[PDB]
């Protein structure tokens, strides 16, 4: 009776708390004359104890009023959300699309009851329009869905990113829509409706008020978060991370293909090697090595292979690391052995080839930039290697008299001392990881000599030891707050954090430059980016990738020049 009162709009009345109203809304047609059009919208009887827009339009085949698309005129921003039937974008569907516009009830597109393309025309224009901001909670999740369903979208403000950056890695939890709204608005949403059934072709009135309020609330969060971002000078990083959403969606939708031939083959190889070692039993070495490399990889990897496409679609995390670097899970691309024997199982698609680029010594160059160390900066500008430079200082030799053994000792000194080791730790570090046999009298000479010449590094280290601060920033002003002071983590953070800024910005510029040649971004790990392109744009994509990374480094570094090592390859092991 009341339960089916609005079945023509595909709505179930679960508690008699929904009325259909019809009123005259003032609009402007493209001819700049005010067309007052009457619209049917829904509203609750029991009013909500807050100020969020809880009314909503619903769009379907039987009530579509084309004049609805006139609310989208001369708008600069709008809240955007979707409701899905599940988490996996390949196995699920978009149930709803909600667009909240300032002062108007939310426009809800009933996707399960729309079969005319002309209805979604006004929608696609808003999504594509680079001049309208779309405010989103979890933009990766929602953009990933829209992209996979042939929706184009540009210009995004993720409230999750703003909230995560404002927290400065002080918390792991508290970044769901419900928590954010309770903190910045003191409103509690009916989160119970997450577990409701979105698969049916009917929705109840409670599901639709949640869909409206969880989209309009974005309009108020944007105003508060936009402001806090500015008061914390986080606009540069927040802008880079928002633009980096689309590249990351690219990397997850594209996935990376696997060559099941060499996978099965190599699997049998390691299996037989394990059997042989078991019979002979060298013991610990070959047995533990082959056992771990077998079970912790050759057996787990097949589980993530898409059965139909032979592709792996990892999950890239944008803001879940301390430094700000990317991380991945299911699978964890940095847990794959860095060996050519194993990495050659990942191949491009048919008629395509990989282009792989890395930075040489970006971390050490960043340290020289932020410390204004003159000897290091002058040496890099003369294209003198930093390990040769340190070898020159330690041995007092001229570059023509420096042998490979000198540069090896210099590598240990540089990586050990720049990041805050003392001479006693340097000895253990050197003998352990480099195979040297230095004495404490030598390492104390290295320590005193290193900081006697690298006066920028010494001033850097000394001031950090003195202030014992808990707040640190990067060159993008990505901020973090330590629970307690740690010398080595304070030195490492600005360096590693700045790498994250440079790589992420490189993916933004790269994602734009690759449209001409329909290039695909595949993966970013450590200091390395991988793209896939058709072989005819091989030589052209090489230049784009290098130029993108170099332009990014140029954005942040003014006194030192990065160096990109690029190579075309058919497999990841090359
Ligand atoms: Cl959420
Ligand atoms: Cl600041
Ligand atoms: Cl911003
Ligand atoms: Cl570099
Ligand atoms: Na969302």
XYZ file of C-alpha atoms and ligand atoms in Angstrom:
579
model
C 0.000 0.000 0.000
C 2.369 2.682 1.245
C 5.203 0.214 0.691
C 4.812 0.401 -3.098
C 3.553 3.989 -3.345
C 6.392 5.033 -5.692
C 7.194 1.831 -7.569
C 7.073 3.777 -10.842
C 10.252 5.492 -9.607
C 11.633 2.133 -8.376
C 11.472 3.086 -4.685
C 10.289 0.974 -1.742
C 8.783 2.860 1.203
C 10.124 1.014 4.246
C 8.825 3.266 7.041
C 6.429 5.867 5.530
C 9.192 8.474 5.764
C 9.284 9.726 2.172
C 7.095 12.203 0.294
C 7.186 13.050 -3.407
C 6.982 16.821 -3.910
C 6.928 18.936 -7.058
C 8.024 22.563 -7.099
C 9.254 25.253 -9.464
C 13.027 25.658 -9.702
C 14.576 28.760 -11.261
C 17.074 27.812 -13.975
C 18.878 29.596 -16.805
C 18.720 28.213 -20.323
C 21.695 28.585 -22.655
C 20.041 31.781 -23.971
C 20.635 33.382 -20.517
C 16.899 33.734 -19.815
C 15.543 32.259 -16.589
C 13.519 29.145 -17.432
C 11.485 28.199 -14.356
C 10.929 24.451 -14.654
C 8.915 22.295 -12.266
C 10.645 19.157 -11.002
C 9.579 16.094 -9.026
C 11.846 15.427 -6.039
C 11.719 13.353 -2.865
C 12.044 14.490 0.735
C 11.818 12.893 4.154
C 8.900 13.559 6.479
C 10.908 13.420 9.706
C 13.479 16.154 9.092
C 17.149 15.462 9.780
C 18.801 17.159 12.768
C 21.445 18.933 10.651
C 21.876 21.143 7.576
C 22.982 18.663 4.895
C 20.913 18.470 1.708
C 18.766 15.354 2.113
C 16.336 15.861 -0.772
C 17.084 14.208 -4.094
C 15.957 13.852 -7.675
C 15.928 10.368 -9.173
C 16.544 9.911 -12.902
C 15.160 6.959 -14.867
C 13.646 6.215 -18.270
C 10.041 6.998 -17.246
C 10.551 10.432 -15.614
C 13.576 11.854 -17.451
C 13.163 15.627 -17.797
C 15.979 16.888 -20.030
C 15.706 20.301 -18.363
C 17.353 18.653 -15.331
C 20.734 19.088 -17.049
C 20.351 22.873 -16.658
C 21.368 22.801 -12.986
C 24.892 21.967 -14.289
C 25.192 25.439 -15.934
C 27.948 27.839 -14.818
C 28.928 25.581 -11.891
C 32.520 25.445 -10.692
C 32.343 22.395 -8.395
C 30.005 19.562 -7.443
C 29.977 16.621 -5.061
C 30.354 13.270 -6.803
C 29.722 9.782 -5.475
C 28.655 6.349 -6.641
C 27.091 3.272 -5.108
C 28.389 -0.085 -6.316
C 27.325 -3.699 -5.882
C 30.784 -4.727 -4.689
C 34.424 -3.802 -4.357
C 35.983 -5.375 -7.467
C 35.437 -3.118 -10.473
C 35.620 -6.007 -12.955
C 33.047 -8.216 -11.207
C 30.577 -5.518 -10.119
C 28.421 -2.721 -11.511
C 27.627 0.922 -10.827
C 24.232 1.015 -9.113
C 23.967 4.802 -8.694
C 25.693 8.050 -9.599
C 24.993 10.994 -7.285
C 25.884 14.588 -8.169
C 25.238 17.251 -5.535
C 25.097 20.877 -6.700
C 25.190 23.787 -4.262
C 21.661 24.635 -3.046
C 19.863 21.997 -5.189
C 18.645 18.522 -4.171
C 21.007 15.740 -5.162
C 20.680 14.354 -8.683
C 20.672 10.550 -8.417
C 21.007 8.509 -11.613
C 19.235 5.163 -11.198
C 21.656 3.220 -13.383
C 19.684 -0.050 -13.190
C 16.656 1.746 -14.699
C 18.293 3.861 -17.409
C 18.637 2.558 -20.973
C 18.735 5.837 -22.954
C 22.133 7.410 -23.630
C 20.672 10.914 -24.001
C 19.981 10.848 -20.244
C 23.662 10.563 -19.296
C 24.753 13.252 -21.782
C 24.636 16.131 -19.298
C 26.451 13.917 -16.796
C 29.395 13.034 -19.048
C 29.939 16.708 -19.874
C 30.364 17.544 -16.181
C 32.772 14.657 -15.584
C 34.893 15.530 -18.632
C 34.845 19.289 -17.989
C 38.334 20.178 -16.767
C 36.961 23.421 -15.276
C 34.463 21.820 -12.856
C 35.908 20.345 -9.669
C 34.477 16.958 -8.679
C 34.713 16.416 -4.926
C 35.037 12.728 -4.091
C 35.633 10.480 -1.093
C 38.022 7.752 -2.295
C 38.598 9.043 -5.794
C 40.671 6.063 -6.886
C 37.816 3.688 -6.079
C 35.161 5.830 -7.773
C 37.209 6.994 -10.765
C 38.355 3.413 -11.366
C 34.695 2.383 -11.638
C 33.647 5.301 -13.859
C 36.625 4.801 -16.175
C 35.958 1.074 -16.529
C 32.379 1.935 -17.570
C 33.482 4.319 -20.337
C 33.085 7.513 -18.341
C 35.731 10.206 -18.753
C 36.651 12.333 -15.747
C 39.140 15.125 -15.072
C 39.784 17.581 -12.223
C 39.278 15.979 -8.804
C 39.448 16.963 -5.137
C 39.645 13.828 -2.986
C 38.515 14.497 0.569
C 40.342 11.311 1.588
C 43.642 12.725 0.340
C 43.126 16.088 2.026
C 42.173 14.350 5.288
C 45.117 11.959 5.059
C 47.632 14.750 4.374
C 46.273 16.901 7.211
C 46.808 13.987 9.618
C 50.543 13.784 8.810
C 50.835 10.022 9.420
C 49.763 10.373 13.045
C 46.966 7.804 12.608
C 46.271 4.715 10.534
C 42.467 4.635 10.950
C 39.746 7.268 10.943
C 39.700 8.069 7.212
C 36.370 6.545 6.188
C 33.603 8.876 5.012
C 31.736 8.375 8.292
C 34.701 9.384 10.471
C 35.594 12.398 8.331
C 32.029 13.733 8.379
C 31.745 13.299 12.156
C 35.006 15.201 12.698
C 34.573 18.186 10.359
C 30.741 18.362 10.488
C 29.604 16.510 13.647
C 27.101 14.577 11.516
C 26.668 10.799 11.615
C 25.614 9.080 8.399
C 23.541 5.895 8.278
C 26.612 3.751 7.565
C 24.387 0.707 8.141
C 23.307 1.115 4.494
C 26.729 -0.021 3.258
C 25.723 -3.629 3.971
C 22.270 -3.242 2.400
C 21.397 -4.893 -0.913
C 22.306 -2.691 -3.880
C 21.909 -5.436 -6.488
C 18.105 -5.279 -6.809
C 16.333 -3.062 -9.348
C 14.540 -1.417 -6.407
C 15.975 0.588 -3.517
C 14.297 1.560 -0.264
C 13.879 5.138 0.926
C 16.631 4.802 3.549
C 19.214 3.712 0.986
C 18.399 6.774 -1.115
C 18.677 9.343 1.670
C 22.074 7.848 2.529
C 23.051 8.096 -1.144
C 21.957 11.740 -1.214
C 23.518 12.806 2.091
C 26.822 10.988 1.462
C 27.138 13.053 -1.737
C 25.989 16.487 -0.580
C 28.160 16.335 2.545
C 31.129 16.585 0.170
C 30.181 20.193 -0.622
C 30.725 21.186 3.001
C 33.886 19.107 3.479
C 35.498 20.682 0.410
C 35.054 24.150 1.907
C 36.556 23.165 5.248
C 39.338 20.969 3.873
C 40.303 23.405 1.105
C 40.815 25.906 3.942
C 42.823 23.699 6.306
C 45.035 22.706 3.373
C 45.863 26.370 2.738
C 46.558 27.134 6.410
C 49.079 24.255 6.430
C 50.650 25.163 3.056
C 49.726 21.730 1.709
C 48.331 23.016 -1.596
C 51.268 21.842 -3.720
C 51.283 18.279 -2.387
C 47.487 18.033 -2.195
C 47.304 19.198 -5.803
C 49.919 16.684 -6.974
C 48.258 13.768 -5.185
C 44.820 14.660 -6.558
C 46.165 14.780 -10.108
C 47.998 11.499 -9.475
C 44.691 9.629 -9.069
C 44.195 9.088 -12.807
C 47.711 7.666 -13.427
C 47.201 5.236 -10.536
C 43.843 4.156 -11.931
C 45.684 3.600 -15.223
C 48.241 1.348 -13.518
C 45.550 -0.726 -11.794
C 43.185 -1.059 -14.765
C 45.970 -1.842 -17.237
C 47.570 -4.424 -14.981
C 50.661 -6.305 -16.109
C 50.640 -9.431 -18.296
C 52.331 -12.699 -17.348
C 54.021 -15.304 -19.559
C 52.571 -18.541 -18.201
C 55.056 -20.513 -20.329
C 58.194 -19.431 -18.468
C 56.147 -19.368 -15.250
C 55.159 -23.038 -15.387
C 58.576 -23.978 -16.798
C 60.520 -22.078 -14.127
C 58.147 -23.504 -11.509
C 59.103 -27.046 -12.510
C 62.768 -25.988 -12.598
C 62.799 -24.724 -9.008
C 60.751 -27.766 -7.961
C 63.298 -30.226 -9.360
C 66.179 -28.212 -7.897
C 64.449 -28.452 -4.509
C 64.076 -32.225 -4.897
C 67.756 -32.602 -5.822
C 68.901 -30.495 -2.864
C 66.632 -32.568 -0.613
C 68.193 -35.826 -1.829
C 71.807 -34.636 -1.532
C 71.143 -33.049 1.868
C 74.879 -25.802 0.502
C 72.103 -27.063 2.775
C 70.742 -23.848 4.305
C 71.735 -21.732 1.296
C 70.190 -23.678 -1.578
C 67.369 -25.306 0.393
C 66.014 -22.217 2.158
C 66.644 -20.121 -0.963
C 64.813 -22.472 -3.340
C 62.091 -23.264 -0.788
C 61.257 -19.609 -0.099
C 61.616 -18.629 -3.766
C 59.217 -21.502 -4.548
C 56.473 -21.207 -1.920
C 56.634 -17.439 -1.295
C 56.430 -16.738 -5.051
C 56.055 -19.484 -7.665
C 53.094 -20.908 -5.710
C 51.443 -17.640 -4.597
C 51.723 -15.691 -7.858
C 49.249 -17.837 -9.867
C 46.501 -16.928 -7.382
C 46.501 -13.295 -8.555
C 46.556 -14.091 -12.292
C 43.330 -13.103 -14.001
C 42.170 -16.398 -15.475
C 40.971 -14.900 -18.776
C 43.511 -12.116 -19.465
C 46.649 -13.569 -17.809
C 47.059 -10.139 -16.200
C 47.838 -9.143 -12.620
C 46.009 -6.089 -11.261
C 47.832 -4.985 -8.142
C 46.509 -2.443 -5.645
C 48.605 0.722 -5.409
C 48.390 2.616 -2.108
C 48.832 6.355 -2.457
C 49.136 7.540 1.166
C 49.772 4.487 3.356
C 53.567 4.770 3.698
C 55.500 6.864 6.182
C 57.610 8.547 3.490
C 54.822 8.985 0.941
C 56.243 6.506 -1.555
C 53.874 4.186 -3.336
C 53.234 0.742 -1.903
C 51.381 -2.228 -3.375
C 49.639 -5.341 -2.118
C 47.935 -8.406 -3.590
C 50.529 -8.737 -4.969
C 53.292 -6.650 -3.380
C 55.344 -5.738 -6.449
C 58.407 -4.915 -4.315
C 58.428 -8.439 -2.824
C 59.025 -9.906 -6.309
C 62.736 -10.863 -6.502
C 64.779 -8.312 -8.464
C 66.391 -11.109 -10.519
C 66.287 -11.362 -14.301
C 65.539 -15.083 -14.057
C 62.234 -14.324 -12.300
C 61.278 -10.830 -13.472
C 61.340 -11.918 -17.130
C 57.944 -13.614 -16.617
C 56.191 -10.225 -16.787
C 55.739 -9.196 -20.416
C 53.750 -6.617 -22.396
C 50.709 -7.351 -24.536
C 50.782 -8.297 -28.211
C 52.284 -5.627 -30.486
C 53.587 -3.650 -27.478
C 56.890 -3.172 -25.670
C 57.976 -1.879 -22.263
C 59.963 1.291 -21.615
C 61.698 1.288 -18.237
C 63.302 4.344 -16.644
C 65.119 4.877 -13.345
C 66.845 7.706 -11.533
C 70.559 7.143 -10.908
C 71.268 8.720 -7.492
C 68.250 10.937 -6.863
C 68.331 10.415 -3.078
C 71.903 11.694 -2.715
C 71.259 14.610 -5.063
C 68.250 15.597 -2.958
C 70.451 15.536 0.155
C 72.887 17.897 -1.558
C 70.071 20.218 -2.680
C 68.355 20.604 0.694
C 71.646 20.966 2.596
C 73.232 23.382 0.082
C 76.468 21.409 0.280
C 78.802 23.256 -2.066
C 81.369 20.550 -2.795
C 78.628 18.056 -3.637
C 76.638 20.505 -5.769
C 79.684 21.738 -7.678
C 80.821 18.154 -8.274
C 77.445 17.053 -9.633
C 77.373 20.089 -11.923
C 80.801 19.087 -13.267
C 79.374 15.541 -13.739
C 81.716 14.031 -11.159
C 80.414 10.933 -9.397
C 79.749 11.321 -5.686
C 81.612 8.111 -4.841
C 84.624 9.235 -6.846
C 84.359 12.611 -5.114
C 84.419 10.995 -1.665
C 87.230 8.676 -2.776
C 89.198 11.769 -3.806
C 88.695 13.337 -0.370
C 89.490 10.184 1.618
C 92.558 9.078 -0.357
C 93.797 12.589 -1.279
C 94.352 11.189 -4.785
C 93.498 12.894 -8.047
C 90.693 11.336 -10.069
C 93.120 9.730 -12.579
C 94.708 7.746 -9.712
C 91.476 6.443 -8.134
C 90.925 2.706 -8.550
C 87.758 0.644 -8.254
C 88.663 -0.365 -4.702
C 88.727 3.308 -3.686
C 85.214 3.921 -5.046
C 83.938 0.815 -3.237
C 85.070 2.140 0.153
C 83.566 5.502 -0.826
C 80.168 3.926 -1.487
C 80.083 2.584 2.065
C 81.227 5.892 3.546
C 78.659 7.908 1.597
C 75.585 5.770 2.275
C 76.660 5.176 5.876
C 77.530 8.712 6.949
C 74.984 10.760 4.982
C 72.166 8.986 6.848
C 73.587 9.408 10.347
C 75.895 6.522 11.255
C 78.829 7.028 13.608
C 82.273 5.622 12.894
C 81.620 2.518 15.019
C 78.456 1.634 13.099
C 80.216 2.459 9.822
C 82.745 -0.307 10.505
C 80.032 -2.938 10.978
C 78.052 -1.576 8.018
C 81.151 -1.693 5.814
C 82.255 -5.210 6.761
C 78.698 -6.565 6.741
C 77.215 -5.212 3.502
C 80.327 -4.380 1.455
C 82.771 -7.127 2.426
C 85.436 -4.764 3.753
C 87.659 -5.137 6.811
C 88.113 -1.591 8.080
C 89.354 -0.739 11.568
C 88.001 1.840 13.981
C 91.036 4.061 13.408
C 90.197 4.179 9.687
C 86.456 4.776 10.144
C 87.187 7.611 12.580
C 89.373 9.102 9.841
C 86.522 8.696 7.351
C 84.044 10.299 9.748
C 86.238 13.304 10.516
C 87.317 13.707 6.893
C 83.785 13.322 5.493
C 82.266 15.987 7.730
C 85.339 18.207 7.429
C 84.663 18.655 3.700
C 80.896 18.074 3.402
C 80.040 21.092 5.546
C 76.444 21.225 4.319
C 75.826 17.670 5.500
C 77.478 18.413 8.846
C 75.349 21.510 9.435
C 72.280 19.494 8.432
C 73.024 16.689 10.878
C 74.061 18.982 13.714
C 70.906 21.112 13.615
C 68.644 18.064 13.591
C 70.504 16.642 16.605
C 69.990 19.967 18.379
C 66.326 20.794 17.738
C 65.163 17.193 18.325
C 62.048 18.177 16.390
C 59.034 15.985 15.629
C 57.711 17.762 12.497
C 59.458 17.384 9.141
C 58.582 18.354 5.593
C 59.645 17.646 2.012
C 60.212 19.963 -0.944
C 56.483 19.720 -1.738
C 55.797 20.522 1.955
C 54.462 17.025 2.597
C 54.418 17.038 6.394
C 54.772 14.279 8.982
C 54.755 14.177 12.785
C 56.923 11.662 14.657
C 55.698 9.980 17.847
C 59.224 10.480 19.241
C 62.504 11.834 17.909
C 64.803 9.498 15.959
C 67.965 10.905 14.393
C 68.095 8.597 11.389
C 64.385 8.826 10.590
C 64.598 12.635 10.590
C 67.410 12.594 8.023
C 65.767 9.947 5.854
C 62.307 11.487 5.657
C 62.962 14.694 3.636
C 65.044 12.654 1.207
C 62.607 9.779 0.707
C 59.595 12.079 0.911
C 60.966 14.243 -1.889
C 61.471 11.174 -4.090
C 57.787 10.393 -3.619
C 56.894 13.936 -4.691
C 59.080 13.675 -7.806
C 57.840 10.258 -8.944
C 54.187 11.146 -8.357
C 54.545 14.408 -10.285
C 56.315 12.487 -13.047
C 53.265 10.246 -13.330
C 50.977 13.271 -13.666
C 53.009 14.826 -16.480
C 53.527 11.380 -18.024
C 49.813 10.551 -18.023
C 49.111 13.705 -20.042
C 51.982 13.316 -22.524
C 50.992 9.726 -23.351
C 47.538 10.507 -24.760
C 48.944 11.304 -28.224
C 50.346 7.772 -28.590
C 47.724 6.003 -26.430
C 50.428 4.965 -23.990
C 49.812 2.924 -20.855
C 51.326 3.433 -17.418
C 52.040 0.035 -15.882
C 53.989 0.269 -12.653
C 56.067 2.410 -10.311
C 58.396 0.766 -7.783
C 61.394 2.208 -5.939
C 62.778 4.927 -8.249
C 61.483 3.293 -11.441
C 58.545 3.778 -13.811
C 57.352 1.355 -16.493
C 55.086 2.210 -19.428
C 53.783 0.016 -22.237
C 53.328 1.324 -25.784
C 52.937 0.011 -29.313
C 56.284 -0.692 -30.950
C 55.831 1.977 -33.644
C 55.874 4.750 -31.021
C 58.858 3.015 -29.389
C 61.403 5.780 -30.046
C 58.819 8.495 -29.294
C 57.642 7.176 -25.916
C 61.283 6.924 -24.826
C 61.593 10.720 -24.998
C 58.267 11.369 -23.262
C 59.177 9.167 -20.304
C 62.576 10.805 -19.857
C 61.195 14.313 -20.317
C 58.380 13.682 -17.823
C 60.724 12.548 -15.059
C 63.264 15.286 -15.771
C 60.583 17.992 -15.760
C 59.349 16.673 -12.418
C 62.820 16.743 -10.884
C 63.297 20.236 -12.300
C 60.116 21.307 -10.515
C 61.623 20.570 -7.088
C 65.421 20.721 -7.600
C 67.089 23.996 -8.622
C 70.791 23.471 -7.881
C 71.267 19.876 -9.109
C 70.292 17.920 -12.216
C 68.799 14.441 -12.145
C 69.890 11.651 -14.490
C 67.444 9.174 -16.023
C 68.586 5.703 -17.093
C 66.072 4.456 -19.653
C 66.003 1.306 -21.756
C 63.504 -0.348 -24.077
C 62.741 -3.929 -23.099
C 60.400 -6.810 -23.879
C 60.442 -8.149 -20.306
C 60.872 -6.685 -16.831
C 64.109 -8.625 -16.203
C 66.184 -6.705 -18.767
Cl 34.649 5.535 3.007
Cl 54.738 25.500 6.570
Cl 44.193 22.082 -2.787
Cl 69.419 11.170 -10.487
Na 32.888 7.913 -2.739
